Design a protein around this ligand. Sequence first.
Ligand SMILES: Nc1ncnc2c1ncn2[C@@H]1O[C@H](COP(=O)(O)OP(=O)(O)NP(=O)(O)O)[C@@H](O)[C@H]1O
Ligand SMILES: Nc1ncnc2c1ncn2[C@@H]1O[C@H](COP(=O)(O)OP(=O)(O)NP(=O)(O)O)[C@@H](O)[C@H]1O
Ligand SMILES: CC(C)C[C@H](NC(=O)[C@@H](O)[C@@H](O)[C@@H](N)CC(N)=O)[C@@H]1Cc2cccc(O)c2C(=O)O1
Ligand SMILES: CC(C)C[C@H](NC(=O)[C@@H](O)[C@@H](O)[C@@H](N)CC(N)=O)[C@@H]1Cc2cccc(O)c2C(=O)O1
Ligand SMILES: [Cl-]
Ligand SMILES: [Cl-]
Ligand SMILES: [Cl-]
Ligand SMILES: [Cl-]
Ligand SMILES: [Cl-]
Ligand SMILES: [Mg+2]
Ligand SMILES: [Mg+2]
Ligand SMILES: [Mg+2]
Ligand SMILES: [Mg+2]
Lengths: 334, 334
Amino acid sequence: MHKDVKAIYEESKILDEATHLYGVQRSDIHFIADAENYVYELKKDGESFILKITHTIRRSPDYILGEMEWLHHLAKGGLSVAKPIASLNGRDIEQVDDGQGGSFLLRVYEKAPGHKVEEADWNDELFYALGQYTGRMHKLTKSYQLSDPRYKRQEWDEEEQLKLRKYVPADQTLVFEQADRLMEKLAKLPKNQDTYGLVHADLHHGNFHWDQGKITTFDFDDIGYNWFMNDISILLYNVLWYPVIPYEDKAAFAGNFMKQFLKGYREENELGDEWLAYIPDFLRLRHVLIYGLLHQAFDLATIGDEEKAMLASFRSDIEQAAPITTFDFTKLSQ
Amino acid sequence: MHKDVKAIYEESKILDEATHLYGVQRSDIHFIADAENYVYELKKDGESFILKITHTIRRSPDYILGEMEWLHHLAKGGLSVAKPIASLNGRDIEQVDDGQGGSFLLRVYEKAPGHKVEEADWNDELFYALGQYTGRMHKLTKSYQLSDPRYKRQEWDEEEQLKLRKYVPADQTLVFEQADRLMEKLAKLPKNQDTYGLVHADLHHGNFHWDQGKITTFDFDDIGYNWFMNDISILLYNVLWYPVIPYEDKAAFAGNFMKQFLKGYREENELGDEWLAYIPDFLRLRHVLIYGLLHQAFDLATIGDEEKAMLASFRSDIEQAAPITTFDFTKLSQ
Ligand SMILES: Nc1ncnc2c1ncn2[C@@H]1O[C@H](COP(=O)(O)OP(=O)(O)NP(=O)(O)O)[C@@H](O)[C@H]1O
Ligand SMILES: Nc1ncnc2c1ncn2[C@@H]1O[C@H](COP(=O)(O)OP(=O)(O)NP(=O)(O)O)[C@@H](O)[C@H]1O
Ligand SMILES: CC(C)C[C@H](NC(=O)[C@@H](O)[C@@H](O)[C@@H](N)CC(N)=O)[C@@H]1Cc2cccc(O)c2C(=O)O1
Ligand SMILES: CC(C)C[C@H](NC(=O)[C@@H](O)[C@@H](O)[C@@H](N)CC(N)=O)[C@@H]1Cc2cccc(O)c2C(=O)O1
Ligand SMILES: [Cl-]
Ligand SMILES: [Cl-]
Ligand SMILES: [Cl-]
Ligand SMILES: [Cl-]
Ligand SMILES: [Cl-]
Ligand SMILES: [Mg+2]
Ligand SMILES: [Mg+2]
Ligand SMILES: [Mg+2]
Ligand SMILES: [Mg+2]
């Protein structure tokens, strides 16, 4: 959570607003998580919904409307996504004055059917199904047309958490050098309809439900224009980071995941073998992004020595330009 | 900091006791750090001292007296170490009742002459000097005679922070499997007076001062019986973790540090080349220890998602039995 948002959020006050805006009682709202947004389950007329709250420090209403517009496009095209629900005043986003020049932004979505994947689900069938779904998502995004420039989502390199100098101590000169080199390397990549588009940009097993083999995604809060190969790499990063079943051999796991994923992906979208060589760079970019996120979450003048000790490990991985995995992804060519 | 100690520490009350025990005004007590102990600089009659405060949750007075007996052995042998200073009541350790049947434990040391190493002093000359000093320390420890068994320091395997099952969730089955395998593997190693003895067990560049080429060590809080090559490996782990000058190539840095260190070490103590093969195991052991330390410091029920995300990276390194570096230390044989 962005440290400046955490500092201003008063939960009982803003949830009181939600009660009137969505026509529920406080007892119908249940906390889920507070990672990037404040997320709650909201019960109304038998059914379950999901309330996500954020703030203008990190999101504008128009930017969120660009998320909703893409969601609509995907749902129209037959992809299972969790759709927004309007407030009692008919709004997709409710804006609440914080009293200090900003706004809390509330929005509600349908609760995706099924559940997050568990050990019994963490297998080749899942990885294949993720590939099929992601392929379908990328094919569908090729026909997306932005209705209004107000709602334009960011390009990959505009991401706030990649602005390391804003959040990381100025003395970490090698960190900035390696990050700069990497973003300069990825900026050399070509972009066309078949390689680059509006993508989810945070695929992971906290952001979808599995309902007897059927995937429904959510958490479209970070969508942006990006390479299809990067969208895939971000999922890989995430499954390597938080594996449902812990692994002893990282390379072997990465290779098997990608083998199964790509079998499914290839049934639904064409992407050239040349992109496989860039997976390691995209994995390194995610690591840089996480280092930025962590610094945007922490005040280094107050955090503990233990947190600093863990941050030191991440710092050195970035300074080394250490590969996330030793698996040679080029061997997964068709 | 041990989470149970952090929970009960009443700083102001305890520092009020320190004013009378060591004869200093509250304004002449300056906070330094709160990593494993609460550490303060004391200013008295134009000289400087160091106050370290802990609690009976993690240390007994007799165990600390074991630290001090070794310090005096080393000092008598000509090694520069920061010696304890008695309180105004003539005691090497002062105890302050916590109100619940435990005690805060206060003790004061000489402030070591010199300063912490910086970028300008991070070079082959330092690494060589560290080798010389460490070799002298190991040679000196061979003649240590323990006075009474009350003051015995622990064997390596008795370390609290290696007791992962006490602090880490029971479901991290692969973590425990790897930790157990490694501890059993190291238990196969031979021990004799030339390979094993009472050692510092936490050498790092936060734990010594450099005064124009002369080293004075401190933070003897974790001394215990261990292999000489593990004492050396622990220093290596620590310089790789918090390098004063960040490196791009970990293996090259590790190799160069050890080459310079061993040149110095070999002038002052003879240790067989067969031990070099065990550096990677000892480095992995330290990584296990740090995982235990972090769990001892954190309450997983209340820590934030950002800390958990960093811990997940650590967990996976242990699960993979990932080597800390790819450098082949057996190439540094004579
Ligand atoms: N539409 C939905 N349907 C069902 N459950 C959901 C839905 N949206 C969110 N959740 C649940 O609430 C959790 C948090 O929501 P999420 O949208 O992941 O928040 P976030 O703050 O953006 N977290 P991050 O994944 O770190 O960016 C998810 O992991 C799900 O458990
Ligand atoms: N004898 C001393 N002379 C000079 N400075 C000292 C001395 N002892 C401690 N310090 C300073 O106080 C800091 C913290 O003391 P230290 O003994 O390292 O505490 P700790 O809580 O055991 N930390 P750790 O290194 O994580 O085990 C050191 O890094 C030095 O900056
Ligand atoms: C606190 C944060 C570091 C947690 C992290 N989340 C992310 O890495 C991403 O959501 C962010 O990197 C992303 N929101 C940043 C962005 N700008 O897109 C982690 C990532 C993750 C991986 C696999 C399964 C998971 O359930 C999760 C998860 O829930 O969150
Ligand atoms: C919060 C804690 C993780 C910080 C860490 N300290 C250690 O790793 C060691 O002091 C402990 O592992 C050690 N006290 C545990 C033990 N049982 O001996 C770090 C280690 C370190 C490495 C290099 C230079 C440094 O200044 C430091 C430092 O000051 O502390
Ligand atoms: Cl709640
Ligand atoms: Cl709206
Ligand atoms: Cl399977
Ligand atoms: Cl005493
Ligand atoms: Cl254990
Ligand atoms: Mg999410
Ligand atoms: Mg999100
Ligand atoms: Mg220390
Ligand atoms: Mg210490």
